[PDB]
Amino acid sequence: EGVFVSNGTHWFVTQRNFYEPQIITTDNTFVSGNCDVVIGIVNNTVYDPLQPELDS
Amino acid sequence: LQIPFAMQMAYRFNGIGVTQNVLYENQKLIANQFNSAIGKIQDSLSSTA
Ligand SMILES: *[C@@H]1O[C@H](CO)[C@@H](O[C@@H]2O[C@H](CO)[C@@H](O)[C@H](O)[C@H]2NC(C)=O)[C@H](O)[C@H]1NC(C)=O
Ligand SMILES: *[C@@H]1O[C@H](CO)[C@@H](O[C@@H]2O[C@H](CO)[C@@H](O)[C@H](O)[C@H]2NC(C)=O)[C@H](O)[C@H]1NC(C)=O
Ligand SMILES: *[C@@H]1O[C@H](CO)[C@@H](O)[C@H](O)[C@H]1NC(C)=O
């Protein structure tokens, strides 16, 4: 829910009706297919919330 | 508020319970069905009053 935006250096997801920028993660995004199909897709890291736990 | 048209159409698909990726994975087909459907309007109105 919401949309991807950039301040010119970083990419955030944010809700459609009130700017509240959030880190892009596997929790706030869903996957479908590879890069090749989509018009205007861009490259960024998507954070994984499990990795601090796998550090234990 | 400006927004790209293929992003407006993803919000519009998301409003009928169809997941956004359906648009982006089919944007060529959806654009051609739309442009073709607009073409039939002129043929219909030109064919009969
Ligand atoms: C885009 O947003 C990011 C995050 O708010 C900005 O990067 C931060 O900038 C402050 C102040 O320069 C630093 O203290 C932080 O350490 C930065 N964080 C990161 C992750 O780099 C970034 O400056 C913003 N871009 C612009 C053009 O304003
Ligand atoms: C997104 O990043 C990938 C790599 O992470 C880029 O893929 C490379 O693109 C060049 C030019 O097409 C190829 O020579 C490389 O072989 C590609 N590498 C891989 C691993 O596929 C991709 O071009 C980037 N996309 C954008 C829009 O910047
Ligand atoms: C966006 O439009 C510019 C021309 O203004 C074009 O060069 C660019 O390739 C376009 N990108 C996408 C994702 O359509």
DSSP A10-26: -EEEE-TTS---EE-BT
Residue nearest atom 10 in ligand 3 by C-alpha distance: A40
- CA B24–ligand 2 middle distance (angstroms): 20
Question: Given in angstroms, what resolution was this structure solved at?
Answer: 3.4
Spatial distance between the Cα atoms of A27 and A47, rounded to a whole number of angstroms: 9
A30-47: b or e for each residue (b if 16 or more CB lie within 10 Å)? Answer: eeeeeeeebeeeeeeeee
Spatial distance between the Cα atoms of B35 and B37, rounded to a whole number of angstroms: 6
Spatial distance between the Cα atoms of B4 and A40, rounded to a whole number of angstroms: 11
Q: Is the CB of A8 under 6 A from ligand 3?
A: no
Q: Which helix (H) or strand (E) holds A4?
A: strand A3-6
What is the experimental method?
Answer: cryo-EM
How many CB atoms within 10 Å of residue A26?
12
In the chain, the amino acid numbered B4 is: P
Q: Are B44 and B38 in contact (CB under 8 A)?
A: no
Spatial distance between the Cα atoms of A39 and B35, rounded to a whole number of angstroms: 18
- B6 three-state secondary structure: helix
Contacts 24+ apart (CB under 8 A), A2-6: A2/A28, A3/B7
